[PDB]
Amino acid sequence: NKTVVVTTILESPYVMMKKNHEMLEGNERYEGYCVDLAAEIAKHCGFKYKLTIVGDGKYGARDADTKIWNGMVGELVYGKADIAIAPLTITLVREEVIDFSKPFMSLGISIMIKKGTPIESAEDLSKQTEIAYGTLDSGSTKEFFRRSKIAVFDKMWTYMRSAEPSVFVRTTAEGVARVRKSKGKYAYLLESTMNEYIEQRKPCDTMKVGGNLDSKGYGIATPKGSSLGTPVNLAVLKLSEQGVLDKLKNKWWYDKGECG
Amino acid sequence: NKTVVVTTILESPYVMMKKNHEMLEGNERYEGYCVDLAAEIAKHCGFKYKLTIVGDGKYGARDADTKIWNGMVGELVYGKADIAIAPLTITLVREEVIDFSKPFMSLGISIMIKKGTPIESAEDLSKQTEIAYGTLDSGSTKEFFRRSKIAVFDKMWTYMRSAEPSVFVRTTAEGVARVRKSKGKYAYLLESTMNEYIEQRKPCDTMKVGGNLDSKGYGIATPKGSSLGTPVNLAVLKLSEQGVLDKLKNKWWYDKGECG
Ligand SMILES: NC(=O)c1c(NC(=O)Cn2nc(C(F)(F)F)c3c2CCCC3)sc2c1CCCC2
Ligand SMILES: N[C@@H](CCC(=O)O)C(=O)O
């Protein structure tokens, strides 16, 4: 029919530029979990497709004043892209404006520390000031804290929203570089999937600590009412049941472990 | 509008008869995780409802010859019930004939043993004959093995389908009673959620061993195209984000732990 325009985001190890990408063209420029998943979904649904990186490098949030959606969510809502194949969290506010498959991977919000940081829990973080902590801008983690009615998580948000200098970061890599370079004086709140990946990468100086703060999943997103949604959803379930999702997770997380 | 007829199944601790049920009428007869969830969903969607236990006591499978659906799935498909609020696994074959919300709880297939049984893995089970092992009839676990192309799980199925006497059981309670009463000579394959619940109940003689064999979730099911599906799905996401699902899990699993 028509080539399907896929929006995605540069986020390890879902979508990464191959080291030799300036030598490559089109879909061949990229590798990772979501690059592989896109090729599986496409095969099972019978479409040809083009991968594109979201212009603003964001997941998706709605401006309070303009009410405009940014990121991959905005690309779907305003008709710039036909499908999002990315670590995109299923949330109530997003479900209302886009379609999502059943989840292809489960996760929760988690804590990342530099090795040796005296912190074991979110409750530990909330009761101290010496170690700063923050989250990614324009995604589900920031919103979880902003919206929470649970005491510990409200205390956290009150602190983070007024901390100087800013505790918030524009990309996952900035958050990680901040943990590494702050000598245990910054902790980062990020999704368990990303945290477990980073923990198995050189220089092997970060760690996931304590249990997850919530339980949720990523799904494949389509514009609301798109005829793509039904076969994409059946494709996610078939790959789940065939053990292909588990095979891909092991490929990109633990087969590529550098820390033992 | 009309009172919504809910199908569910007697399965601990999702839906259980209160000890004093012969003194009680209607929805008051029952307690558990899914009894509580039904009351939350109903409040958030603005409907009145009646709980009913599935007549044949089954989850749902399709006969190879007649192609008739049994269990709760059959109740939905043939229009006997308006909604299923139960530990009902989201699978490809079911998604095709009924509607499902996003998952309200995640699980995987797991192994239950009598304490002291020399078994740590599915691979351990497959390489021996002394200890029998089986699954529930008419659900997702049996079908996982019947359909699997993974060597270890195919070896398992080849054994189970021809074992004498039968390794299969009609209810979870039969499976558990068989583990308890077989002196370590039977192991039971069941969902991790049910396994972890039983492990915290007297006489505290069973255990979950090894990692889960797959990763999946339960969802709330509606007849295909029902106008109930959309608000029910938004209700599951809101309760997730409010921490109500986590609150209910702790209530029925670990607050009621009898083994420490
Ligand atoms: N509460 C949950 O466990 C829950 C989720 N649970 C899961 O994602 C578990 N889960 N559920 C499924 C599926 F539903 F069978 F598709 C799969 C997985 C993981 C592996 C792929 C298949 S996603 C999600 C929630 C609540 C908020 C909305 C997003
Ligand atoms: N997966 C998240 C982004 C990462 C985060 O917020 O921690 C989202 O879809 O917004």
Ligand SMILES: N[C@@H](CCC(=O)O)C(=O)O
């Ligand atoms: N939750 C399963 C039933 C239990 C099992 O198969 O282990 C189903 O919906 O079929």
